[PDB]
């Protein structure tokens, strides 16, 4: 049964609520982004309206084969009327096509649902500046001060330089990058760009990338593995046994693999700066784990909420335990007391 925090009071609306069969009274279903935890339940057989971004809409059509009559894309930064209710989609700075949703309720109440998001100061100059928010449904994934990580720009600098050095020292080295869902595309794109290669990948992944409205994408990616010296593999294959196997398949083109695993947070961030990171090495193979997050750090989160000064806050991640729910109310109270709202 659909939980409370996926319902929008006073409306016929739910958010990211596809795995509970027919939800009593829902006249329209909102989808924040194309990640499996959120889209779970959707298929070709779904027959109620779905509202989403354009890019999310391309993925529903081409990857889950949802029928074109039921997909309702909306443009960002635009006031739209849906079943007699005003709504706005805003970029979440999460993965491609990911959005936050502003609802203007008939009774005068105003609701922000973040979906998944990495808070940024640029969000303070959106359509959010212009008015009050009464309830904030919040992505609280890293809501604890021990969760620190560097900026995206710092991580991408490290990866580029790491790659460029190794391949310049050894022209016969192959670079590999792990993936399992959409997001974090910049890692493999930036690396290929400094190396003057296209990125090689499977047909199922090529298809996926074609739905993302990336500029000049056709110049950047390819299905011809042999033409490329930056390869994508599924994340699970990024270990010593999986890579040794993959090297055999390249046929004496390459004598060395350097591989990158994009992770979220890991406990090694409590002690080690990004500059100081080192790889796990076995023979002619090396594997770097790098902390590229598309979710807000603790400080990023704290700033956004303190700026927004919402009247009530509802969490959407880490809700499943009493300890978690308790810890989150304590941080919300300190933030409220520190900023005076
Ligand atoms: Ni997500």
Task: Report the distance separating Cα 75 and Cα 110, nearest Å.
Answer: 20
Tokens matching residue 274: 């990004």
- Strand ranges across the sheet with 50-52: 7-8, 13-15, 28-30, 50-52, 71-73
Sequence-distant (6+) residues with CB within 8 A of 52 are 30, 31, 32, 60, 71, 72, 73, 74, 97, 99
Report the separation in Å between the CA atom of 235 and the middle of ligand 1, taken as the mean of its atom positions.
17
Q: Give 113-162 as a 3 state SS string.
A: ECCCCCCCHHHHHCCCCCCCCCEEEECCCCCCCCCCCCCHHHHHHHHHHH
Report the separation in Å between the CA atom of 173 and the middle of ligand 1, taken as the mean of its atom positions.
33
In order of their start, the domains of the chain are 1-147+296-341 (3.60.15.10), 148-295 (3.40.50.12650)
Resolution in A: 2.7
Task: Report the distance separating Cα 283 and Cα 245, nearest Å.
Answer: 14
Residues 193, 195, 198, 204, Cα dihedral to 10° = -90
Strands (E), the chain: 7-8, 13-15, 28-30, 50-52, 71-73, 80-82, 85-91, 99-104, 110-113, 135-138, 173-179, 199-200, 221-222, 230-234, 256-263, 280-282, 285-291, 312-315
CB 90 within 8 A of CB 77: yes
HSE toward the beta carbon, residue 335, CA cutoff 13 A: 25
Task: Report the distance separating Cα 3 and Cα 208, nearest Å.
Answer: 30
Report the separation in Å between the CA atom of 36 and the middle of ligand 1, taken as the mean of its atom positions.
8
Report the separation in Å between the CA atom of 190 and the middle of ligand 1, taken as the mean of its atom positions.
22
Report the separation in Å between the CA atom of 255 and the middle of ligand 1, taken as the mean of its atom positions.
37
Report the separation in Å between the CA atom of 96 and the middle of ligand 1, taken as the mean of its atom positions.
10
């Amino acid at each position: 049964t659909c939980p409370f925090y996926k319902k929008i009071p006073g409306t016929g609306f739910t958010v990211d609520a596809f795995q509970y069969g027919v939800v009593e009274g829902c006249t329209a279903y909102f989808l924040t982004h194309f990640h499996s935890d959120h889209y779970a339940g959707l298929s070709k057989h779904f027959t109620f309206p779905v509202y989403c971004s354009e890019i999310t809409g391309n993925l529903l059509k081409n990857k889950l084969h949802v029928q074109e009559q039921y997909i309702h894309p909306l443009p960002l930064d635009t006031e739209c009327i849906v079943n007699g209710v005003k709504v706005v989609l805003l970029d979440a700075n999460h993965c491609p096509g990911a959005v936050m949703i502003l609802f203007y309720l008939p009774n005068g109440t105003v609701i922000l649902h973040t979906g998944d998001f990495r808070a940024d100061p640029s969000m303070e100059r959106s359509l959010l500046a212009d008015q009050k928010v009464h309830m904030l449904y919040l992505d609280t994934t890293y809501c604890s001060p021990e969760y620190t990580f560097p900026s995206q720009q710092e991580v991408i600098r490290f990866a580029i330089n790491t790659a460029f050095e190794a391949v310049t020292l050894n022209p016969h080295a192959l670079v590999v990058c792990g993936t399992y869902s959409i997001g974090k595309e910049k890692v493999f794109l930036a690396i290929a760009d400094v190396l003057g290669s296209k990125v090689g990948m499977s047909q199922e992944k090529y298809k996926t990338l074609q739905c993302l409205n990336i500029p000049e994408i056709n110049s950047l990616i390819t299905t011809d593995m042999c033409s490329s010296l930056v390869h994508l593999l599924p994340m699970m294959q990024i270990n010593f046994k999986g890579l040794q196997s993959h090297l055999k398949k390249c046929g004496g083109k390459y004598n060395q693999i350097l591989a990158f695993r994009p992770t979220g947070w890991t406990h090694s961030n409590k002690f080690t700066r990004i500059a100081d990171v080192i790889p796990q090495t076995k023979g002619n193979i090396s594997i770097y784990g790098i902390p590229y997050s598309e979710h807000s750090s603790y400080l990023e989160m704290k700033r956004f909420v303190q700026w927004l000064k919402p009247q009530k806050i509802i969490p959407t991640v880490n809700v499943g335990t009493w300890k978690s729910r308790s810890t989150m109310e304590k941080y919300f109270r300190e933030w409220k007391l520190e900023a005076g709202y």
